[PDB]
Amino acid sequence: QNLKSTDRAVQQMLDKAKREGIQTVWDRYEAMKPQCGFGETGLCCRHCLQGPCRINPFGDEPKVGICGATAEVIVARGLDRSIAAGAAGHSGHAKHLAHTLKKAVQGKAASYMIKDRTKLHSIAKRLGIPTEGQKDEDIALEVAKAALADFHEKDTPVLWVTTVLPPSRVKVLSAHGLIPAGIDHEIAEIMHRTSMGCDADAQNLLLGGLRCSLADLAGCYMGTDLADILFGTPAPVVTESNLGVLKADAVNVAVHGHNPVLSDIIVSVSKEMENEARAAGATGINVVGICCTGNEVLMRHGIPACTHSVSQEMAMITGALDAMILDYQCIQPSVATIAECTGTTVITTMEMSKITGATHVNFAEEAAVENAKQILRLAIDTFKRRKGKPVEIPNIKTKVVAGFSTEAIINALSKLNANDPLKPLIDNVVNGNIRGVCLFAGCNNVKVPQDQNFTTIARKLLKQNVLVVATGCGAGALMRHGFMDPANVDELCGDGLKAVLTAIGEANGLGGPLPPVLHMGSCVDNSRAVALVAALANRLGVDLDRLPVVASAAEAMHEKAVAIGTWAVTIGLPTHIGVLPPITGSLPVTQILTSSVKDITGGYFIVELDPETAADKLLAAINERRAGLGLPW
Amino acid sequence: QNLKSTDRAVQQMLDKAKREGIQTVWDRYEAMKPQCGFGETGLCCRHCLQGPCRINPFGDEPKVGICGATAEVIVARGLDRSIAAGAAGHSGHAKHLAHTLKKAVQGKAASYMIKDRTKLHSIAKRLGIPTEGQKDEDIALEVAKAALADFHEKDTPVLWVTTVLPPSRVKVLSAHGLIPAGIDHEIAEIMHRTSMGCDADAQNLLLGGLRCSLADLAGCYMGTDLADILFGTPAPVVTESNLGVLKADAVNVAVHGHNPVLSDIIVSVSKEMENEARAAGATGINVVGICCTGNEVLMRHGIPACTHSVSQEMAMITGALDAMILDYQCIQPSVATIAECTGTTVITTMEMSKITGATHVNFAEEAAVENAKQILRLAIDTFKRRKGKPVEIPNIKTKVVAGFSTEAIINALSKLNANDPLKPLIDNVVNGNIRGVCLFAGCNNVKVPQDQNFTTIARKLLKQNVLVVATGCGAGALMRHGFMDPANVDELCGDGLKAVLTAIGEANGLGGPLPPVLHMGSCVDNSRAVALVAALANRLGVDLDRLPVVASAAEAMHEKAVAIGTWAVTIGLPTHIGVLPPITGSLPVTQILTSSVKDITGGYFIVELDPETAADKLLAAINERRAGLGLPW
Ligand code: SF4
Ligand code: SF4
Ligand code: FES
Ligand code: FES
InterPro entries given for it (chains A, B)? Predict the structure, then answer.
């Protein structure tokens, strides 16, 4: 089973699924082979009813689409649609939170409130919203209106782009016409320009894609900002991960999806319902996380993470998962069918994300506590039905230190230099103790043995003294393999990095180092890494494309990951992707995305499926940046 | 060549292309055969990097997508994306016109102005915008702001839906949650919900698709409204169509695309440049139309239509097309390559729609006259280079009477009943002289011999006394085969329909009938048919799903046509489509779209590729509606 997942708990559940005849994501992948090479290379178009059009990568006809669309146009249009779809997800998440904040401060949703008043005021100041003499509720109402205004054209550009990057970077992007005019405006313009008989120049198409990726960035940053106002900015926390966090004698409730607007409430209400669970014969309610909603409550409340991404079905296979509470994004719809075999109650909560055969509970912010209790009572009912039945929870878990928001990272650094907190980090970049920074982001993908690229690359970078930060299911992969346990610093980290992690941790009263990898949160919280990198650029007086900072979507799957990778390139980072995106059918598109975009934004994609080779390429990118700053490497 | 096109001028140019070795859309189609059956049936998904996933329609594995997405989810997600892409095009067109009107009334674009002040005031009244005591420029500024506001969420729903359909229809749609909250909001929500791991219930997905189709309707209606304010509401006009409208001794300039914001200016400026053209050895500038921008200037100014849709390359093959001036949508990008052989200067004008190898002229409303003169001077240069060369313009054209805006139709009817203009039409529906109404809409499609479905269906309906109206390239197909020439009324029309067309025409001072088919304009001007049908419903006191009105996208191609067909169903019409949409791989989706949606909106799709059978099915739908109103049939 090691060829499917490198996670030993997942392997154990794959054996259980096999002997019980439960079909998994890996079985469905095997049944798909061999996959279509036209789609894999990007040489397929279905944008009108004259299609499908395909193009043979080499040889004889077909060589061009029916309407005349070339291989490079077809490849660029498909890629742009993926970017727009990703932007639509991250910004739909952000839009929902903006409406939640507006309802809260207008007295329409008493379960929600301004929890981080400091963050509220800093965001207002960053946006140019006056705070002196204003009530918090009025400032927040203005912030929520500004968030909603960024979805459409107005007299200013998207402020969740222009106010979050340094003026020099905004100037570069503006010169190329890349600043978004409105988030949903850009998504719609992509769908228009890529429709039949519209944009048919690969460079023009890809420039539109870069601009739409910045609309995705704006949605990510807005989502983090609003979630922090509503639910609190993360600070360091200690918890656990992997399937062993499930407890046979408790009501096990997974929160799964991305938007934690209800799942933050689930966490608090579940505490109130201890006694009701105890009356049912359970020790209590054990809330666990899956995917990014799990990251959100891990970051803010220390909720343990049960599993992530490709292996999500395995939590159900234990037999102990009483409920899976779903919002949207990255939920395999197979869960609704597997639930018939495993007994789990799968519950959807968002109007636009339902799954046939799953129970739906309308969630409304105005009734959030009431909805939570109804949902948790279904979970309690499910626990009762399995009283007495054996379960198979693998006794496998790791320790996870997390909660490294950018505010938390700055505060940790400020223990070494109170009035200039970024300086200790820059000092160690300059002296070589920190070679550079790598952000791991994105998903697992069934084509890659689960976690193998994240861990193989992370190990090589850590040995070379790279400061590694992680979000999303990249953070999930690293946490499940021990990369967030400070006890593994000695094994994993080069001497210089160990010295820095130890110096920071000792100054924070820990008696021990920071963990080998800093967990910066969910997928939208890739925006936190942007905030840190922008602050470093501002402090050094250089643009982001001069910093020794790279990104790696080492096992990417979702359209959201394509959008993130593209905005990482657009803000100026060398950006690795470890699965093939559908671009290899066009050499001109590949050349733009891996080479000539350097001349536009300073960033570029590094496509590399072999993880040892990818780590070498990422280190070369970091070291090239070091050389450009005159640093040793 | 008759198997490729039923248009004799197109056949002549296909022979010329063949002997000159110029590859056409039909050659590129032949080179694509056999096409992929997974894509044709809808059983392919590329929404994440685990794909492509396909599903065998019958037999053995694969049976389900890798993530667990069923055939019905995959089919519904793909369809929803097509609807959103169509909505993005029609509403991008409308958004551009809203910005043009705003610039005009703020003194920023002197080439544009309020030409239809009556239409402006009626729209303002329909929207609830006060007009008493207000300057026209202020009313128009308010209308343009309202148009822009409908793209995003606000305290009202999309007013270009709720103010254009009768309250009873709005109530039905509201009860099912189908009223759009904002145009670009719905497009983004579709892209979100159809991304991996999000909506996975076919009924829920398709209801979202119906709502997004109404965002498309709003964009169509807004585009017609704003184009009428800026450029004038159409009134009846007489002109010609087909390749014989090109003139060997003139500078022939085609306007091609959809948004006539510059091409209306091209028409006026070309008149000013007669003498400059005459100095070059030409008789003048002969502006001709292709596709919907051609329809726009045909409707408003009588500009002759040269060709449409699938046969657009053939205008270039004549050797006489000096320039092709492009905005966006439905332009085969092959034109940029064919131009090397034919000498035509292909010019793009919109930032988001460029074609490699075509000259780009930045158009800006603020410089519209200056841009037009630069473009027309390139055309004049091109004419000079072909002085002396023979050309092959087929001597084939038809007479076209057009300009039937809904205002024009009401005014024509008012000559029979001044104070109750709809009553003469209803009278003849009730007595059987008019059996019903059919709207022909949409594109040609290379899979169908060009125009064969439109003409075969139209002939059968006209013989059965159906009032036939047409837009877009459906109007193009019918005009090129004589269906807009009143001289063909005797041959084509049943006795009852002939009596009505004759009575209306005689009362309008014509001495002869209205044409066999009423040309209601461009693709966005499908909204004019909605306005007429809604007015009829309001006058009869019934909802639209009780009227004997149907639609036929008989040769559909573009994502825009999928969106139009879907909103035709959503507002309550039986809606034929004559090419296979990618739904046959899912019986449950097909059943929803062809059967159970009747219980939701009262409309339904009729999928039928054989045109004689399609006409029988459309007549059965009309006659079922007649029976429900207690009428003979
Ligand atoms: S848009 Fe062009 S390439 Fe795509 S399916 Fe239609 S004809 Fe084929
Ligand atoms: S979304 Fe599901 S069905 Fe579509 S490509 Fe990804 S795994 Fe396959
Ligand atoms: S031919 Fe397989 S993805 Fe289209
Ligand atoms: S397998 Fe051919 S369209 Fe995807």
Answer: CO_DH_a-bundle, CODH, HCP/CODH, Prismane-like_a/b-sand, Prismane-like_sf
The ligand that comes nearest to the alpha carbon of residue B46 is 2
Report DSSP letters for B193-207, one per residue.
HTSTTS-B-HHHHHH
CA pair distance A149, A133, nearest whole angstrom: 24
Residues of B in contact with A100 (CB under 8 A): none
- Euclidean distance between CA atoms B282 and A199, whole angstroms: 33
Tell me how far apart the alpha carbons of residues A256 and A253 are, in angstroms, rounded to a whole number: 10
What is the per-residue DSSP string for B140-178? HHHHHHHHHHTTS--SS--HHHHTTS-HHHHHHHHHTT-
Pick the CATH number of B406-633 from 3.30.565.10, 3.40.50.2030, 3.40.190.170, 3.90.1210.10: 3.40.50.2030
Header resolution in angstroms? 1.3
Indicate the DSSP class of residue A44.
E
3-state secondary structure of A454: helix
Measured between alpha carbons, how far is B69 from A74 in angstroms, rounded to an integer? 25
Q: Where are the domains of chain B?
A: 60-234, 235-403, 406-633
Ligand 3: residue whose CA is nearest its atom 4: A44
B97 burial type by CB count under 10 A (0-12 exposed, 13-18 middle, 19+ buried): buried
Judged by CB atoms closer than 8 Å, whether chains meet at A67 and B25 is answered as yes
Q: How far is the CA of A200 from the centre of ligand 3 (A)?
A: 20
Chain A: give the shortest CA distance to residue B14, in Å.
16
Sheet with B574-577: list strands edge to edge: B517-521, B466-471, B436-440, B549-553, B574-577, B604-607
Nearest to B365 by CA among B261, B231, B267: B261
Tokens of A497: 């990095």
Q: Is A198 annotated as a binding residue?
A: no
Residue B499 burial class via C-beta count within 10 angstroms: exposed 0-12, middle 13-18, buried 19 and up: middle
Q: How close B134 comes to chain A (CA, Å)? A: 25
How far apart, in whole angstroms, are the C-alpha atoms of residue A190 and residue A464?
A: 40
Q: Is A292 annotated as a binding residue?
A: yes
Q: How far does residue B53's CA lie from ligand 3's centre (Å)?
A: 9
Distance in angstroms (rounded) separating the CA atoms of residues B411 and B232: 16
Inspect the interface and report whether the beta carbons of A191 and B191 lie closer than 8 Å: yes
Which two three-digit tokens encode residue B200?
A: 């996975």
Tell me the CATH number for domain A60-234. Answer: 1.20.1270.30
Instruction: Give the span between the Cα atoms of A30 and A446, in whole angstroms.
Output: 10
Q: Do A188 and B193 touch (CB under 8 A)?
A: no
Q: Do B328 and A84 touch (CB under 8 A)?
A: no
Ligand 3 touching residue A232 (CB < 6 A)? no
> How many helical (H) and strand (E) elements, i.e. helices and strands, does chain A have?
27, 16
Secondary element (H or E) of residue B324: strand B321-326
User: Are B60-234 and B235-403 the same fold in CATH?
Assistant: no
Assign a CATH topology to domain B235-403.
Rossmann fold (3.40.50)
| B contacts of A63 (beta carbons < 8 Å) | 31
Q: What share of chain B is helix, strand, coil (3-state, %, to 5)?
A: 50, 10, 35
Residue among B201, B193, B153 at smallest CA distance from A257: B193
- Of B498, B491, B482, B486, whose CA–CA distance to B435 is shortest? B498
Q: Which ligand is nearest to the CA of A199?
A: 1
Which token pair is A366?
A: 């105005």
